[PDB]
Paper text:
Based on its similarity to other parvoviral replication proteins, such as Rep72 of the adeno-associated virus (AAV), [name] is predicted to contain one nuclease domain (Nuc, aa 1–176), one oligomerization domain (OD, aa 201–270), one SF3 helicase domain (SF3 HD, aa 271–501), and one zinc-binding domain (ZnD, aa 571–671). The SF3 HD domain of [name] belongs to the SF3 helicase superfamily, which unwinds DNA with 3′→5′ polarity. Totally, four cryo-electron microscopy (cryo-EM) structures were determined, which revealed the detailed mechanisms for ATP binding and hydrolysis and DNA binding and unwinding by [name].
In the complex structure, [name]_200-501 assembles as dodecamer. Although no DNA unwinding activity is observed for the K334A mutant, WT [name]_200-501 can efficiently unwind the DNA. The DNA unwinding activity of WT [name]_200-501 is comparable to that of WT [name]_2-570.
Numbering used by the authors:
A (entry chain L): 202 to 278, 286 to 400, 407 to 499
B (entry chain G): 202 to 277, 286 to 400, 406 to 499
C (entry chain F): 202 to 278, 286 to 400, 406 to 499
D (entry chain E): 202 to 279, 286 to 400, 407 to 499
The structure:
């Protein structure tokens, strides 16, 4: 398609540069804007013709970082010193293979399997890892914040959705399968998928119907999930994980060979394969 | 009727050019505009008087492509084509089917405004429906609309799709109007017929009423439908039929002789006739 | 368990004989009592005490014919000339095998497959055969009488449930599966065996209505509970109404013959009803 | 079917006698009993054990005169030109004998689907007078005008005749009206277990009302269930009111004559009723 012949004035052009400035600094909310740059926020809000541009610039900045720029481009900025690499080795999982899946999963390239699942006993790093990734994406939603009756609202404009320590009820089991499967919502189709990560101590394939466990949806939920078993406690020295840990870890994994990935990626298994001593990278051996 | 004499200004002329640009590139929604041309969208939304033009232009662009211009103009080796293989495998004359679609999509079949695809599952019923539905300017689906109010938002569409449809007694009287091409009562007082395609694994002539099927409406529905039997299963690798195949197929059907179709057009039959080995046009014999 | 040692008076014994009389003559409703025995109905309703026995005797009479007696006994009592035998031959189904399956199905001995499904084009004897079976059992009720949003009320206390020209919606699809599979309703568990179901339809009922669409998520589950018969061959318009004498004669004849093939199939029930084997047909039907 | 051999006491026998007395003297309502026999009515209500017998007697009396005894017997009584009914039918160019032989079949539900009589024409032609005359003769009769507007067909069972004076059919009730006009029992009666109908009108009732608009979609289906008589010639102003004595005399006379003229018309039940043949009219009416 040929771009339109229209030419913008200096006021319109300066607005365009402001939209580009917002994306380049990851400023996607009004509260974030005030902290990052209060002088420009004060100047813009001086008039009704300027306070309008505050709303419009944020709606366009969100769209640019969500539907035009792939999310992985935000994640790409001694490997053994990185806390995430140590954590995945403590859980007996290959740090390279997990990292390569995250790049594919956050880009919605996995097809139906749009859902991750960190499963294990309490205090094993499940919430920390999930929140660390969520901090490194432009905008992320959360089921816990939403209404208890409509947990799957406000999914548009989110590059990621975090469902921490959640359980699937029968009243929302049908809406869950749509979101977990990456299928766009019926409302989205009429008015026109987001990666989902779940942490849990119990098996979420058991749907809560009334006061009774049900296993009707066991197969449907497994076709959409990839499960990681976090069954080993982490030393308290781990503390809180930073965004730079994710960026360093994912940048290294992207530059390595992908050959091991598509071999497993041909047959998407519900459970993530464990460590094999043959396929370990020499840097981690 | 002579057009109004008064000429416009530079600002209004540029808006008119933008409207003609939207129709050319088949941009009828804001999301389609952002994906195609984010630059012009950003500049327009720099002011209140600019974001007004975005809403005003799209409403005129949709109206131009639906009411002022015939839909067939947006629709426009022969054996190699996937669709003609699909039609021949079902033992239906490809020239007759293509010549019917052009007259049907233009709302010129009188009372028989509705096509119907019937047959066993996985025989390409929905695949062909989407191919035609994706080529028209704007298409709507009964699935998207509200469960108890399925025929809202039917104006402004070039085609309405009813996939896996079943006619309930609560909407059977509303369905008969839209199936026959009769304009809706609200459309009358705020002032016009849209083609409908139905794909179903079952005989939709059977109307559901409670926990029981009734045939009192069978004769009336047969007056408005045209039926195609997709009985033979197709190749497992048929693939997604695209806009290019529809444009190729209908263009060839338009070029050939129309005398054969007008014999059938004199009296419309509920069942669509099959191929005659000698009446088949020499490009396909 | 030993019955209680107590004995009744003259009045209590006469009431017991009245309850037995209702079962023999199949009087399970007041309207049936009025048609048959108006004299005894007039004598009983002459007082408030007597009118109580009318309501109470029907409760025990219906219960005896539904729980204390197998339903096959009320079905039992030239075979080629039987109209049902003619109907099953036109549709290419073995009369001996159909009858032998009905007897076990009407007695809830088929396990999961508690449902019979008749399918075919219109005017093929689907309702006729179903109605004849339905009117031969002591008490029958149809889904077509119940409320639209509560199709399965009054199911308990019946010998058969008929669902004529029926279709399954996603709102009741969960309630339907329990009854079709013979699983007792939740309310029955906390207030205390299912009821055999026969369904006739011109379309495929495995498809489940949801909104204005069709779905097959319940297609596999429903097939585990139903046995399907294909009523495709057009019948002669002068076949007429199938009667109880046709049903009783047909089932009694099937009960008399050997079951040898039936145990072979009954090892693993299939969804579709198997067709006729020309060599396995009984010589009395040849 | 052998009746139960239980024999009641003296008190129960007397109640049975009182049931036979109510049916004999056409006493079917509480008020009618007070007019006909106040001495017995006072005696029964002297105690609670007695005032219960009153309700049970009326329930059985209405049933015996509606569901067990044919209605035609009560229309019959236990110069023909002297009857004012024949005068009315002659003016409308209708053979008086053929009309009477039809009523004996229409009131007994024997006319198949064509269950409802329709009287049509300009005002003051005796449509209501004739219809109310037959209505007053049957044991128990109900009217649609008495029932509430939203549910016109409550309390239909237990009635020997339903009258619909100057009626109009709305689309909200057209589906329910089709069953009662066609003689089909309603859904309620089927689960808890045919009434002749007469309609008079100044206009075409087949024009079903729908909103502020008149539609003809149901006209063909309604015509399948009605018989029409066109009352056009205005009667003499001194017509008076038709009585049950005239209905009993006219209908009894029509029973005695031959039926071959009517039995031939029953071969094809047309919508309109045939007119007078100048030479086929019975000699007594000449
Ligand atoms: N805010 C924090 N500050 C310091 N250390 C933290 C913090 N959050 C988590 N940790 C450390 O991270 C490790 C596990 O934490 P966490 O991710 O919360 O496990 P968890 O599985 O989510 N607990 P649970 O929610 O019950 O499943 C421990 O070593 C904690 O000390
Ligand atoms: N997205 C797709 N990509 C490739 N092939 C497809 C796709 N969708 C359908 N097909 C093929 O199209 C053929 C028929 O599919 P489909 O159009 O879905 O039939 P269908 O009638 O819609 N099934 P049903 O809805 O149950 O009646 C098969 O050979 C499929 O493999
Ligand atoms: N009451 C009846 N009187 C006369 N013939 C009857 C009657 N009931 C059924 N038949 C005949 O029985 C045959 C099949 O009728 P029926 O059993 O009603 O098929 P059907 O499946 O119920 N029709 P449909 O509901 O459209 O599928 C036809 O030849 C009918 O004429
Ligand atoms: N109770 C009565 N006493 C005397 N004359 C009566 C009585 N009822 C009706 N008539 C007469 O009977 C004739 C016919 O009137 P009627 O039977 O009421 O027709 P109608 O159908 O009621 N008029 P309409 O309802 O407008 O079509 C008239 O001459 C009336 O005066
Ligand atoms: Mg946690
Ligand atoms: Mg499909
Ligand atoms: Mg039927
Ligand atoms: Mg009047």
């Amino acid at each position: 398609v040929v771009p339109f012949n229209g030419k913008g004035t200096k006021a319109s052009i300066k607005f365009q540069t402001m939209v580009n400035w917002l994306c380049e600094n990851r400023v996607f909310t009004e509260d974030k804007w005030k902290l990052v740059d209060f002088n420009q926020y004060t100047l813009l809000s001086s008039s009704h013709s300027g306070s309008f541009q505050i709303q419009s610039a944020l709606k366009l900045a969100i769209y640019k970082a969500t539907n035009l720029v792939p999310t992985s481009t935000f994640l790409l900025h001694c490997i053994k010193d990185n806390k995430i690499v140590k954590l995945l080795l403590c859980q007996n999982y290959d740090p390279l293979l997990v990292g390569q899946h995250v790049l594919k999963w956050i880009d919605k390239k996995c097809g139906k399997k749009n859902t991750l699942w960190f499963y294990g006993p309490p205090s094993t790093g499940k919430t920390n890892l999930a929140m660390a990734i969520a901090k490194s994406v432009p905008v992320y939603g959360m089921v816990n914040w939403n209404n208890e009756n409509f947990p799957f609202n406000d999914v548009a404009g989110k590059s990621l959705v975090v469902w921490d320590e959640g359980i699937i009820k029968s009243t929302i089991v049908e809406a869950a399968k749509a979101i977990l499967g990456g299928q766009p919502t019926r409302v989205d189709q009429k008015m026109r998928g987001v990666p989902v990560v779940i942490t849990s101590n119990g098996d979420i394939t058991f749907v809560v119907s009334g006061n009774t466990t049900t296993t009707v949806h066991a197969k449907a939920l497994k076709e959409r999930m990839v499960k990681l078993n976090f069954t080993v406690r982490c030393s308290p020295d781990m503390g809180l994980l930073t965004e730079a840990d994710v960026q360093q870890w994912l940048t290294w994994c992207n530059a390595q060979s992908w050959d091991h990935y598509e071999n497993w990626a041909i047959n998407y298994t519900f459970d993530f394969p464990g460590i094999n001593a043959d396929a370990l990278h020499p840097d981690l051996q």
